[PDB]
């Protein structure tokens, strides 16, 4: 979890809370996606919205599939191997873009690249294909960079 930002670490805490609220006995890709969409002003959320995807629409489609469990375990809810894979893919996606940090945008790209999980299935069906979201990530950051250079020009 070394290079995780405050916001990228809060998405994993909210994943544990989302699993607990639904009384699930596991943290899957679904809970990392439900964690992510709390951060409405981050690059991940802004990337999806700029592709005409709505956050509460993502929530409804994830929740319809995964349902509700019997009872959350009393201790830590265990991450699934694919949930672990999403987090590993997120930290390999950051360097490839030339980023010195793991942000909400890398977790979104991790969820999509994982490919097999509920998160990837929901996002792909809403038109959140990997290369399309990557391009949107890059354009948003380049777009933010230009606005802040205008600011900087006092």
Residue numbers in the entry: 2 to 155
The article reads:
Since single mutations at sites Leu92 and Leu96 of ClpC1 caused a reduced binding affinity for ECU, the crystal structure of an engineered double mutant was solved to investigate the mechanism of resistance. Since the L92S mutation had a lower affinity for ClpC1-NTD, it was chosen for the double mutant. Superposition of the structures of ClpC1-NTD-L92S/L96P and the ECU complex resulted in an overall r.m.s.d. of 1.12 Å or of 0.71 Å without the three N-terminal residues. The N-terminus of ClpC1-NTD-L92S/L96P is a curved loop in approximately the same orientation as in the RUF-I complex and apo forms. Looking into the changes at the mutation sites, a distortion (‘kink’) in the helical backbone induced by proline and the missing nitrogen bond acceptor of the carboxyl of Ser92 was observed. This C=O bond protrudes out of the helix axis and is at an approximate hydrogen-bonding distance from NH2 of Arg4. Accordingly, the L96P mutation apparently does not have a significant effect on the length of helix 6 as both the ClpC1-NTD-L92S/L96P and ECU complex structures terminate this helix at residue 97, while some other structures terminate at position 98. This subtle alteration is significant in relation to the binding of ECU, as the conformation of Arg4 may be important for the three previous residues of the N-terminus (Met1-Phe2-Glu3) to adopt the extended ‘ECU-binding’ conformation for site 1. However, in ClpC1 the L96P mutant confers ECU resistance, as do the L92S and L92F mutations. As shown in Fig. 3(b), it was observed that the double mutation L92S/L96P introduced a kink in helix 6 and replaces a hydrophobic residue (Leu) with a more polar Ser.
